[PDB]
């Protein structure tokens, strides 16, 4: 018989993040991969728009710091959430899976946070 | 046999059985109610109701109006004191189902809307959409889950009942999955098994509607009343026999012959009304019977379109408009598309008359009790005497909750003041059910049950149809007699134990043959034409209130014979004339 | 005792390989990988960006591989498949009634795709015209 | 005339003889109208009387039909041979124990369904007062989700279920949702526990196959997503309440 008083799950926290994350990477991730993963390394940009100096200038700005953080972090919380479940879907036993993936997220999050308060 | 103790046992989880279980659970919070059904409750026929459930509600209406309607429609064969009780309780029952969550369609102000059915002058039929039965059965079922008092025996095929010294003591059923028999003891039993349409070749019914309950009561001296009145629905799909709600027409649909001529005008239901305004009582909205007969008549003239699935007439709905066609009547448009492959927006639907409802059923008093103390019947399988010789549209669902509540309350009382019975006798009954079952199992003969089933249906379809003649009724009686003899040479080749449907279908078939014979004899004997019963032989073509204003009681004795007896009809305020 | 012997069909780790609909599902979740990979890459860049032009050029040199260019091209495809599918799914979370009828998802799917296009433009403008 | 014939492969299983399910092949007459349910009948009537299966309405409204046709959950009565001239393999509804032939154990489903209290809760209105007032607008909130015939096709479609038999399931949750969304009910709290469970809405990763198959376009998937959102609100509320 079905448990009459089950334990509340904590998924709403991770789902939450994964949600905002999934939405951020849906609207803003395409363009960014274009700029950083294709335009930049192929010089396909006007003058010195993507030159060390200019990027650095951005990165160091307030808005640039925030954007940088979110652009990195939010996607992580999304995708790691997804790989965590993919494990199950694939029937791959992963010890403390929850700690693993979500921990990896937190660590990276922090790391990212250090970097944007600038190294 | 394992034994279960219950205050009352209900056989059937359809509209009636459920409404019954709940009323009993609310009546006695401490009772232990055994609800039994051979399919999970929601698979009961009730789920397939599409038109609506009657209940007085408009300001310009009156219980009187509903009473009259009911009585006239039943050609005065209604137990008038019962009809009264009925109309007065509908509003309460329909309202209660609303409180339980039944999503009745609404008026823009939030009130429940109503529509016309059964040819009533004042609309008073409540409705889900064209999924009313689905919604009522499901509301009821779900509502029942909150009462622990009700213990369900899902997929338990009730075999026979246990009677001793005129009082019911319980029943023997078979755990379908397990294949094992069980004893349920109860000082009250409510029969809510449904009708017997399935004894007909083409019907609107579900596989399960085999008349088991009626057959059971028959074995114990109880008589089935007015079994000759079988109601045919005018518009059903050829072959499948699947119902096409009266709604189609109430919305504007027309019926035409191979010449696209709206033939209904030539049968006293003219003058033709414009594609725009349908008018109750006229054309495609005329008397049910007249409409079904018109089909026959068109058939004689050779005006029916010939098709493999059979001859038909067309149900044209195009002139409604896609939005109404596709968006308003989803199911149908889906039913039609799926089973006859036809888009009601691009083409006409083939249809013909189909066996649909069983007016008859186990005889009961105004409290749904039978001649056997503690044995009650409610629902289509019964005969409270509400429908007489012709049920009114949307009155059957209403009945389910109105009398199911009563049956429930009354049964509770009857089990509380029952007293004890002879244990050795009751246990001997059970042993008998068991023995009988073994006999059927070991029975050999190499006769295929299925073919008997098929012949039974063709017989009823030819001998007990829309128009009857002594010649063909007799022919059917003789056929059934024969089939009864063949039934004893049937061999159930499947001796398995887990969900053995071969055996269960074979048992169901038996009840059907018995029930069929009460139908036929009843009809052959009613030398008159009333309601659903229409004869063509001289001196039998009209209604005879001088000699037949009475109920037909059909009894089946231990020697296998079907005897008739007649009872009077309780008049109160509406004498016949 | 029971004569019932309930047969339970096992479920392999390759269940999704059968039916396409599942395959497409796995594929949709698959986008997760390239997605983090990219986040990783952004981290590399971020820190290279701080260890001076010297390191940053070393980063840019990495992105020019060009096997990393193919991988990144795959990353862009995946990302778009994500956007495609995400917008379809997202609307199923809202229960909105527009005049007695449950609307969507088309109205919402359109909006999201509009926001994305405008964002893609404003971003490309900001990052390149100045 | 002359009807065409179709070799249909049916997966038989007798727990009193068989150790494991095994195919069987029957030749069945058929035309542009013949349905799988029709075919099953013909088989039981003329080729194999021991073929057991569930059914009733014959019009896709009762829901006992449930079974697999070439790995796709469907209703036997809404499946037509005309669409399987290149082979047809019929098996018991997936993700449920096979009891006998095409009949499975629907117990879990029932219990799950019972577990979410699918019934109007906490409303004191009584019959003599008249019915509740509910606008079409209000009804539109849960209507689609009330058309569920408990057929079981979504459970055969859901991989999560196949992987977690303790998952209450699409239908179960939809039903719960349906009441939580009915303006007449006041027992949402009575239902959340089960929805919040790991075995509740959270067991679902939105594969979406369930809604793909609902023979009654209920869209359980959409109900579950909305469910998560409510669960989520519940989880917050519960957090901002100390002690
Ligand atoms: C066929 C039909 C009838 C119908 C209709 C549409 C169709 C296609 N539309 C209607 C409408 O719009 N308005 C209305 O007034 N009536 C309409 N009807 C007729 C009406 O709905 C039916 O007459 C009514 O459904 C009868 O319901 P009832 O409560 O009497 O019971 P049931 O639904 O037929 O179910 C029978 C139950 O009994 C169980 N059973 C039967 N035999 C056994 C045995 N041997 N052992 C254990 N259980 C048994 C079944 O399992 C079932 O639960
Ligand atoms: C709140 C954020 C929000 C609106 C989320 C809805 C967005 C979508 C499309 C979610 C669907 C979705 C997906 C794709 C999952 O993989 C998954 C895996 C495990 C649990 C839940 C989910 C889930 O809800
Ligand atoms: C300061 C005002 C402002 C918003 C300037 C735009 C500056 C430009 C063109 C930035 C380019 C730019 C973008 C868009 C990145 O995503 C990115 C990601 C990781 C490392 C570096 C970069 C980077 O330099
Ligand atoms: C920078 C903010 C990080 C905050 C860290 C605080 C962690 C505290 C965890 C406590 C969680 C308590 O749950 C409370 C809810 O009421 C129910 C109590 O019974 C226990 C239920 O199970 C616990 C649920 O929490 C599970 C895990 O939460 C992990 C946090 O991950 C968030 C990372 O933030 C990074 C996003 O960019
Ligand atoms: C810097 C690395 C920190 C790792 C952060 C990982 C956070 C991931 C949290 C995931 C928690 C998952 O719960 C797993 C247990 O299985 C039971 C599931 O049912 C729910 C039970 O309630 C959840 C309990 O976990 C609570 C997490 O508390 C957060 C940890 O704080 C760590 C701080 O480390 C800093 C000290 O040096
Ligand atoms: O079913 C219908 O639409 C009309 C009818 O006669 C019935 O209620 O049985
Ligand atoms: S949600 Fe659809 S597939 Fe699922 S049980 Fe209900 S009707 Fe069947
Ligand atoms: S397929 Fe299963 S994963 Fe969720 S969307 Fe349907 S219940
Ligand atoms: S027989 Fe009723 S759902 Fe198919």
3-state SS, one letter per residue, for B487-512: HCCECCCCCCCCCCHHHHHHHHHHHH
| C-alpha span between C32 and C79 (Å, rounded) | 9
- SS3 category, B381: coil
Is the separation of the CB atoms in D213 and D93 below 8 Å? Answer: no
Tokens representing residue B294 in the block: 């018109």
Please tell me the number of the ligand nearest to residue D61's CA: 9
Rounded to whole angstroms, the Cα distance separating B415 from B422 reads: 16
Pocket of ligand 2 from Cβ distances under 6 Å: A 15-16, 19, 22, 82, 85; C 29, 86, 89-90, 93; D 205-206, 228
DSSP letter (8 states) at residue B346: T
C-alpha span between B448 and B154 (Å, rounded): 29
For chain A, domain boundaries: 1-119
Q: Which residues pair with B8 in a beta bridge?
A: B33
User: Rounded CA gap, D225 and D170, in Å?
Assistant: 10
How is residue B373 annotated by DSSP? B
d(CA B358, CA B195): 5
What are chain D's domains? 2-105 (3.10.20.30), 106-243 (1.10.1060.10)
Partners of A12 on chain D (C-beta within 8 Å) are 202, 228, 231-232, 235-236
Determine contact, residues D45/D29, Cβ cutoff 8 Å: no
Q: Is B240 annotated in some ligand binding site?
A: no
DSSP per position, B78-122: S-HHHHHHHHHHHHHHHHHHHHTT----B-TTSSBPEE--TT-SS
For A2-24, letters b (16+ CB in 10 Å) and e give: beeebebbebbebbbbbbebbbb
Q: Resolution in Å, one decimal, please.
A: 3.3
How does strand B361-363 pair with strand B382-383? parallel
* β-pairing verdict for B382-383 and B375-377: unpaired
Q: How far is the CA of D225 from the CAs of A98, B153, B498, D190, D197, in angstroms?
A: 22, 34, 39, 19, 15
- If phi > 0 it is left, if psi is from -120 to 50 it is alpha, else beta; for residue D60 that is left
Question: What whole-number distance in Å separates Cα of residue B334 and Cα of residue B326?
Answer: 9
Q: Which tokens belong to D160?
A: 């999560």
CB B178 within 8 A of CB B498: yes
Q: What are phi and psi of D100, to 5 degrees?
A: -165, 130
Q: CA of C2: which chain B residue's CA is closest?
A: B178
Nearest to B177 by CA among A68, D10, D69, D52: D52
Find where tokens 């038989």 sit: D12
Provide the β-strand partners of residue B191. Answer: B11, B377
The encoded tokens of residue D110 equal: 């029932």
Per-residue b/e over D204-226, b at no fewer than 16 CB within 10 Å? bbbbbbbbebbbbebbbbbbbbb
Q: Which of B88, B67, B75 is nearest to B359 (CA)?
A: B75
DSSP three-state, residue B205: coil
Alpha carbon distance B518, B554 (integer Å): 6
CATH code at A1-119: 1.20.1300.10
C-beta separation of B99 from D126 below 8 A = yes
Q: How far apart are CA B548 and CA A45, in angstroms?
A: 101
CA distances from D45 to B451, B506, D49, D51 (A): 8, 12, 6, 9
Closest CA to C40 of C64, C63, C23: C63
CB A105, CB A76: distance < 8 Å: yes
Looking up tokens 């809405």 gives: D201
Question: Is A24 annotated as belonging to a binding site?
Answer: no
Helix (H) or strand (E) holding B182: strand B181-185
Q: Which of C8, C18, C19 sits opposite D97 (nearest CB)?
A: C8
What is the C-alpha to C-alpha distance for residues B134 and B210, in angstroms, rounded to an integer? 20
Helix (H, G, I), strand (E, B) or coil at B540: coil
Question: Dihedral of CA A35/A39/A45/A47: which sign?
Answer: positive
Among residues B116, B167, B169, B233, which one is catalytic?
Answer: B233
Pick from B43, B145, B499: CB nearest D52? B499
Across B111-133, b (16+ Cβ under 10 Å) vs e yields ebbbbbbbbbeebbbbbbbbbbb
Contact B159, B153 (CB under 8 A): no
User: Strands B33-37, B150-154: parallel, antiparallel or unpaired by DSSP?
Assistant: parallel
Contact residues on chain D for A81, CB-CB shorter than 8 A:
none
B389 annotated as ligand-binding: no
Query: Measured between CA atoms, how close is D243 to chain C, in angstroms?
Result: 32
CATH class of C1-130: mainly alpha
**C-alpha dihedral (B493, B498, B500, B503), degrees to nearest 10:** 70
- Contact of D198 with A11, CB cutoff 8 Å: yes
The architecture in CATH of the region B1-236+353-422 reads 3-Layer(bba) Sandwich (3.50)
Nearest Cα to Cα of residue C64 among A37, B327, B309, B429: A37
Is the peptide bond prior to B377 cis by the omega test (within 30 degrees of 0)?
Answer: no
CB B452 within 8 A of CB B509: yes
| Half-sphere exposure for C83 (CA within 13 Å, toward CB) | 23
CA distance B70 to B535: 23
Residue A84 CA, distance from chain mean position: 14
Domain B543-577 has CATH 4.10.80.40: yes
Task: Name the method of structure determination.
Answer: X-ray
CA distance, residue B497 to nearest chain C CA (Å): 7
Phi/psi of residue B430, each to 5°? Answer: -50, -50
Cα C65 to chain centroid, rounded: 24
Place of tokens 């001998």: B463
The continuous run of DSSP H or E covering B333 comes out as: helix B330-340
How do beta strands B8-11 and B189-191 pair? parallel
CATH numeric code, B237-352: 3.90.700.10
User: 10 Å Cβ neighbour count for D240?
Assistant: 6
Which candidate in C15, C89, C92, C98 is best for mutational testing of the D interface (most D CBs within 10 A)? Answer: C92
| Helical pair D36-46 and B449-463, crossing angle rounded to 10 deg | 120
Phi, psi (rounded to 5 degrees) for B219: -65, -20
Token pair, residue D242, equals 């100390």
CATH of domain B423-542: 1.20.58.100
Contact present, D73 and D66 (Cβ < 8 Å):
yes
- Cα–Cα distance, B519 to B225 (Å, whole number): 9
> Nearest 5 degrees, angle CA C62-CA C65-CA C69?
100
- Gap from CA of C93 to ligand 8 centroid (Å): 14
Q: DSSP for A17-70?
A: HHHHHHHHHHHSHHHHHHIIIIIGGGT-SSTTTTSHHHHHHHHTSHHHHHHHHH
| A76-103 residues labelled b (16+ CB within 10 A) or e (exposed) | bbbbbbbbbbbebbbeeeeeeeeeebbe
Using DSSP's 3-state secondary structure scheme, residue B224 falls into strand
B556 is a catalytic site residue: no
- How far apart CA D118 and CA B65 sit, in angstroms, is 37
CA distance linking residue A68 with residue C17, whole number of Å? 38
Q: Is B167 helix (H, G, I), strand (E, B) or coil?
A: strand
Closest CA to B139 of B128, B154, B153: B128
Please state whether beta strands B361-363 and B349-358 pair in parallel, antiparallel, or not at all (unpaired): unpaired
Q: Exposed, middle or buried, C19 (CB in 10 Å: 0-12/13-18/19+)?
A: middle
CA B557 to the chain's CA centroid: 24
Pick from D165, D211, D22, D18: nearest CA to C11: D165
Whether the upstream peptide bond of residue C66 has omega within 30° of 0, thus cis, is yes
Contact B57, B112 (CB under 8 A): yes
Rounded to a whole number of angstroms, the CA Rg of chain B reads 23
Exposure class string for D133-146: b at 16+ Cβ within 10 A, else e: ebbbbbbbbbbbbb
Q: What order of strands is seen across the sheet that includes strand B562-568?
A: B382-383, B361-363, B224-225, B550-556, B562-568
* DSSP calls for chain D: ---EEEEEEEEE--TTT-SS-EEEEEEEEE-TT-BHHHHHHHHHHHT-TT-------SSSSS-TTEEEETTEEEEGGG-BGGG-TT-EEEEEPTTS-EEETTEE--HHHHHHHHHT--S--S----GGG------HHHHTTTGGGG------HHHHH-HHHHH-TT---HHHHHHHHHHHT-TT---HHHHHHHHHSTTTGGG-----HHHHH-TT---HHHHHHHHHHHHHHHHHHHHT---
* Cα distance between residue D33 and residue D81, in whole Å: 8
Q: What is the length of chain C?
A: 130
The answer to whether A83 touches A101, Cβ cutoff 8 Å, is yes
- Distance of alpha carbon B398 from alpha carbon B420, whole angstroms: 35
**DSSP strand pairing (B361-363 vs B375-377):** unpaired
Chain length of chain B: 577
Q: What residues does each domain of chain B span?
A: 1-236+353-422, 237-352, 423-542, 543-577
Please answer whether residues B219 and B508 qualify as being in contact, where contact means their C-beta atoms are separated by less than 8 angstroms.
no
Q: Helix, strand, coil % (nearest 5) of chain C?
A: 75, 0, 25
Per-residue b or e along B187-210, where b marks 16 or more CB atoms closer than 10 Å to that residue's CB = bbbbbbbbbbbbbbbbbbbbbbbb
Interior angle at CA B136, CA B134 and CA B139, nearest 5? 105
User: In B172-326, which ranges are continuous DSSP H helix?
Assistant: 212-219, 247-251, 288-301, 322
D neighbours by CB contacts (3+ pairs under 8 Å): A, B, C
Q: Count Cβ atoms within 10 A of the Cβ of residue C9 and give its class: 0-12 exposed, 13-18 middle, 19 or more buried.
A: middle
**Are B463 and B472 spatial neighbours (Cβ–Cβ below 8 Å)?**
yes
Chain C hits for A18, CB-CB cut-off 8 Å, are none
Q: How far apart are alpha carbons B400 and B9 in whole angstroms?
A: 17
Query: Which positions ≥6 away from A103 have C-beta within 8 Å?
Result: none
Is B138 a known active-site residue? no
Please give the annotated binding residues of D for a menaquinone, written as ranges: 13, 225-228
Whether C16 contacts D158, CB under 8 Å: no
CA gap B42, D191 in Å, rounded: 22
Token pair recorded at residue B69 = 């309607």
Candidates D62, D82, D123, partner chain B, best to mutate (most B CBs within 10 A): D62
Tokens of B121: 């002058």
Query: Looking at chain A, which subunits does it touch, using at least 3 CB pairs closer than 8 Å as the criterion?
Result: C, D
| Spatial CA neighbour of B18 closest among B32, B36, B6 | B36
Q: Is B292's C-beta closer than 6 angstroms to any atom of ligand 6?
A: no
| Phi and psi, residue A79, nearest 5° | -55, -30
Identify whether the C-beta of residue B417 lies closer than 8 Å to the C-beta of residue B117: no
DSSP state of B278: -
Kind plus residue range of the DSSP H or E element containing B234: strand B230-236
String of DSSP letters for B389-414: TSPPTTHHHHHHHHHHHHHHHHHHHH
Which residue has tokens 């399988």?
Answer: B381
Buried b (16+ CB within 10 A) or exposed e, B464-487: bbbebeeebbeebbebbeebbebb
Closest approach atom of ligand 6 to CA B395: 8
Whether the Cβ atoms of residue B324 and residue B251 lie closer than 8 Å to each other = yes
Answer yes or no: do C46 and A36 touch at CB < 8 A: no
Task: Write down the residue that tokens 């997605």 correspond to.
Answer: C35
Which alpha helices (DSSP H) does B228-329 contain, by range?
247-251, 288-301, 322
């Amino acid at each position: 018989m079905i448990n009459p008083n089950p334990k509340r799950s904590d998924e709403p926290v991770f789902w939450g993040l994964f949600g905002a994350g999934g939405m951020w990477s849906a609207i803003i991730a395409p363009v960014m991969i274009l700029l950083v993963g294709i335009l930049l390394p192929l010089g396909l940009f006007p003058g010195d728009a993507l030159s060390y100096e200019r990027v650095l200038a951005f990165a160091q700005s307030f808005i640039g710091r925030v954007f940088l953080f979110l652009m990195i972090v939010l996607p992580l919380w999304c995708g790691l959430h997804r790989m965590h479940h993919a494990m199950h879907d694939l029937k791959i036993h992963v010890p403390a899976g929850k700690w693993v993936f979500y921990g990896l997220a937190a660590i990276l999050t922090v790391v990212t946070l250090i970097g944007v308060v600038t190294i | 046999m394992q034994t279960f103790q219950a205050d009352l046992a209900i056989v059937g989880a359809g509209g009636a059985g459920l409404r019954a279980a709940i009323a009993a659970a609310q009546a006695n919070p401490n009772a232990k109610i055994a609800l039994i059904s051979k399919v999970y409750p929601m698979r009961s026929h009730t789920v397939a109701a599409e038109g609506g459930s009657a209940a007085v509600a408009q300001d310009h209406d009156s219980f009187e109006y509903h009473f009259h309607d009911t009585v006239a429609g039943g050609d005065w064969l209604c137990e008038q004191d019962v009809v009264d009780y009925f109309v007065h309780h509908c509003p309460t029952e329909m309202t209660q189902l609303e409180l339980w969550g039944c999503p009745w369609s609404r008026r823009p102000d939030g009130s429940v809307n109503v529509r016309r059915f059964g040819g009533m002058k004042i609309e008073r039929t409540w409705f889900a959409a064209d999924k009313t039965g689905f919604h009522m059965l499901h509301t009821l079922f779900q509502t029942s889950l909150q009462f622990p008092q009700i213990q369900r025996f899902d997929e338990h095929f009730v075999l026979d009942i246990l009677v001793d010294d005129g009082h019911v003591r319980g029943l023997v059923a078979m755990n379908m999955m397990e294949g094992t028999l069980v004893q349920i003891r109860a000082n009250a039993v409510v029969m809510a098994t449904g009708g017997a349409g399935r004894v007909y070749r083409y019907n609107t019914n579900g596989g399960i509607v085999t008349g088991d309950g009626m057959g059971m009561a028959l074995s114990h001296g109880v008589p089935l009343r007015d079994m000759e009145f079988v109601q045919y629905h005018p518009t059903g799909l050829p072959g499948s026999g699947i119902l096409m709600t009266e709604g189609c027409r109430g919305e504007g649909g027309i019926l035409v012959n191979k010449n696209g001529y709206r033939y209904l005008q030539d049968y006293g239901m003219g003058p033709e009304t414009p594609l725009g305004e349908p008018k109750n009582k006229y054309m495609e909205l005329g008397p049910r019977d007249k409409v079904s007969q018109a089909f026959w008549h068109e058939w004689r003239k050779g005006n029916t379109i010939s098709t493999p699935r059979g001859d038909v007439v067309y149900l044209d709905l195009r002139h409604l408009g896609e939005k109404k066609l596709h968006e308003r009547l989803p199911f149908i448009c889906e039913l039609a598309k799926a089973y006859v492959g036809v888009d009601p927006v691009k083409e006409p639907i083939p249809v013909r008359p189909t066996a649909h409802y069983t007016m008859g059923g186990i005889e009961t008093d105004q409290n749904c009790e039978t001649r056997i103390k503690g044995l009650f019947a409610v629902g289509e399988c019964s005969s409270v005497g509400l429908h007489g010789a012709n049920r009114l549209g949307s009155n059957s669902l209403a009945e389910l909750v109105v009398f199911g509540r009563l049956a429930g309350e009354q049964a509770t009382e009857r089990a509380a003041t029952a007293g004890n019975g002879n244990e050795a006798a009751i246990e001997a009954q059970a042993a008998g059910v068991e023995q009988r079952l073994k006999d059927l199992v070991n029975q050999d003969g190499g006769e295929n049950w299925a073919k008997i089933r098929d012949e039974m249906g063709l017989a009823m379809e030819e001998g007990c149809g829309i128009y009857r003649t002594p010649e063909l009724m007799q022919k059917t009686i003789d056929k059934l007699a024969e089939l009864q003899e063949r039934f004893k040479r049937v061999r159930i080749t499947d001796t398995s134990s887990v969900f053995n449907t071969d055996l269960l279908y074979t048992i169901e078939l038996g009840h059907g043959l018995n029930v069929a014979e009460c139908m036929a004899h009843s009809a052959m004997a009613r030398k008159e034409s009333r309601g659903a019963h229409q004869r063509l032989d001289e001196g039998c073509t009209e209604r005879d209130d001088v000699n037949f204003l009475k109920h037909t009681l059909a009894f089946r004795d231990a020697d296998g014979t079907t005897r008739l007896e007649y009872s009077d009809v309780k008049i109160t305020t509406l004498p016949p004339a | 005792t029971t004569k019932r012997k309930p047969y339970v069909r096992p479920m392999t780790s390759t269940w999704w390989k059968k039916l396409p609909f599942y395959r497409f599902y796995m594929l949709r979740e698959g986008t997760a990988v390239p997605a983090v990979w990219f986040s990783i890459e952004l981290i590399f860049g971020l820190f290279a960006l701080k260890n001076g032009p010297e390191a940053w050029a070393g980063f840019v040199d990495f992105l020019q591989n060009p096997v990393i260019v193919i991988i990144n091209l795959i990353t862009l495809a995946a990302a778009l498949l994500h956007t495609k599918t995400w917008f379809e799914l997202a609307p199923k979370a809202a229960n909105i009634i527009v005049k007695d009828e449950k609307m969507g998802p088309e109205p919402i799917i359109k909006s999201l795709w509009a926001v994305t296009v405008v964002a893609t433009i404003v971003i490309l403008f900001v990052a390149l015209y100045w | 005339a002359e009807m065409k014939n179709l070799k249909i492969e049916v997966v038989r299983y007798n727990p009193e003889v068989d150790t494991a399910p095994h195919s069987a092949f029957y030749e069945v007459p058929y035309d542009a109208t013949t349905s799988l349910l029709d075919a099953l009948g013909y088989i039981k009537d003329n080729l194999a009387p021991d073929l057991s299966y569930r059914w009733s309405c014959r019009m896709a409204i009762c829901g006992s039909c449930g079974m697999m046709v070439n790995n796709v959950p469907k209703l036997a009565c809404k499946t037509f041979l005309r669409d399987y001239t290149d082979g047809m393999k019929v098996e018991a509804l997936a993700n449920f124990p096979i009891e006998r032939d095409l009949v499975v154990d629907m117990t879990h489903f029932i219990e799950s369904l019972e577990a979410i209290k699918p019934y109007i809760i906490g409303n004191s209105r009584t019959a003599d007062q008249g019915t509740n007032i509910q606008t079409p607008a209000q009804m539109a909130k849960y209507h689609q989700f009330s058309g569920c015939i408990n057929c079981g096709l979504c459970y055969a479609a859901c991989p999560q279920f196949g992987l977690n038999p303790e998952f209450i399931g699409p239908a179960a949750i939809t039903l719960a949702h349906r009441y939580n969304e009915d303006s007449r009910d006041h027992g949402k709290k009575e239902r959340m526990a089960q929805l919040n469970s790991q075995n509740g809405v959270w067991s679902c990763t939105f594969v979406g196959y369930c809604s793909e198959v609902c023979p009654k376009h209920v869209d359980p998937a959409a109900a579950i997503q909305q469910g998560k959102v409510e669960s989520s609100k519940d989880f917050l509320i519960a957090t901002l309440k100390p002690r």
